[PDB]
Structure 1
Amino acid sequence: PQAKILSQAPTELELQVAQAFVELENSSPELKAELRPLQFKSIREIDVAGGKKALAIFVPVPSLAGFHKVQTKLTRELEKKFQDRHVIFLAERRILPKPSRTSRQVQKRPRSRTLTAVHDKILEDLVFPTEIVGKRVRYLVGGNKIQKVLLDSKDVQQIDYKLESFQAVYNKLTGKQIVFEIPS
């Protein structure tokens, strides 16, 4: 069911991940019952400077609620299969362009659709399940911003080998830099 799981676009990686998906529900009773209604839209591959890459997975928003109840095992298996790839699960959130001074008719574009909210959501998903404890922008003496995200201590080990990957992923999707840190 590699054409059953996707949404109207078959590519190599997407078919391979949908097929791995199938072979992964085929070895379980509860995981298969949960993963079957879980569709995902598209996939993107983006590299890190370690020699390996990362597989970002775009998900329709109303399904992420369910996706989060499985994501630990799912990424476990999908990482044991697709090796030398760091697997990340993002939502698909459509951003609306800011109303121009001559923007004609637009409905009151909601805050959930704002560029800010969306990027701070990309941050949120980027490090599931560990929880963001506070952010901190540094303003350098060269005129460069650096957004410093701070994380918890409950799921350090689940993400510890993935930090650098985020710094690539995020940079590819937002254009902004980022550094991660953990409370002493």
Structure 2
Amino acid sequence: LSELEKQVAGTLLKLEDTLYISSVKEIAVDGDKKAAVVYVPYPMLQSFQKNSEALILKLEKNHSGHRFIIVANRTIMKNAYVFTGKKSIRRPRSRTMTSVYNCILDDICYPIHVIGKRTLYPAGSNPRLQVVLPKAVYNEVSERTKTYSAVYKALTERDTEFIFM
């Protein structure tokens, strides 16, 4: 129920010639360009994953002004066990914070599979994570690394940066 959703829905209705979205989030970047994150419901992420590179390209080409990213919305629970007083309810591991952040990171760059992760602990600077991408693909993704860092920082307060190795 906001302007962006109206035109993106119209777009989607134009593209076919069955799948719907949950919400849309827009995150700012240092440059005037912004990012739009589309929250896909979990059961159909794979439905929006097969041919989604074309989908994002067409969406960007229709309404310019900021890049489009597709991610799923996952829930995080804050207790390993829940004590109802009589028995105990165990939290599934899929609902942890560490798993969710890793899945988000994979989803942000879904077409390109992450090759490694490292976190550095400088003497004074806040610890930061740096990930490693395939050396084959670069110029395709070189121009969208600041946006990736910004969106990852927004969703998860953890900061990061990108390189190729």
Q: How does the TM-score come out when normalised to structure 2?
A: 0.91
Aligned partner of residue 180 in structure 1, secondary structure: strand
Equivalences for residues 67-106 of structure 1 within 5 A: 67-99=48-80, 104-105=83-84
Match of 1:66 among 47, 54, 79: 47
Alignment of 1:38-77 (within 5 A): 38-77=19-58
Distance 1:63 1:153, change over 3 A: farther
Q: Displacement, 1:112?
A: 0.8
SS in 1 for 2:4: helix
CA distance in structure 2 between the partners assigned to 1:129 and 1:155 by the alignment: 11
1:129/1:155 contact within 8 Å kept: no
**Residue ranges of structure 2 left out of the alignment (5+ in a row):** none
Structure 1 residue 153 displacement after superposition: 3.4
Question: What are the superposed Cα offsets for residues 148-182 of structure 1, whole Å, 9 maximum, x if unpaired?
Answer: 11111344343222110011111111001011111
Distance 2:20 2:141 in 1: 24
Residue 52 of structure 1 deviates from its aligned partner by: 1.0
Report percent identity of matched pairs.
35
2:83–2:89 Cα contact (<8 Å) kept: no
**Aligned-partner Cα distance in 1 for 2:140–2:109:** 10
State the TM-score, normalizing by the size of structure 1. 0.82
Counterpart check, 1:150 vs 2:129: no
1:178 aligns with 2:160: yes
Structure 1: unaligned runs, 5 residues or longer: 1-9, 29-36
Native 8 Å contact 1:96 1:109 kept in 2: yes
| Residue correspondences, number | 162
User: Would the aligned equivalents of 2:37 and 2:70 in 1 still touch at CA under 8 Å?
Assistant: yes
Over 3 Å counting, the alpha-carbon distance change for 1:15 and 1:122 in structure 2 is same
Deviation string 1:30-52 (CA, Å, 9 cap, x unpaired) is xxxxxxx2211010001110111
What does residue 135 of structure 1 align with? 117
Paired residue for 1:20, among 6, 11, 32? 11
Stretches of 4+ moved more than 6 A in 1? Answer: none
The code of the aligned residue for 1:53 comes to K
1:98 deviates by: 2.9
Q: Are the structure 2 counterparts of residues 156 and 38 from structure 1 closer, same or farther at C-alpha, using a change threshold of 3 Å?
A: farther
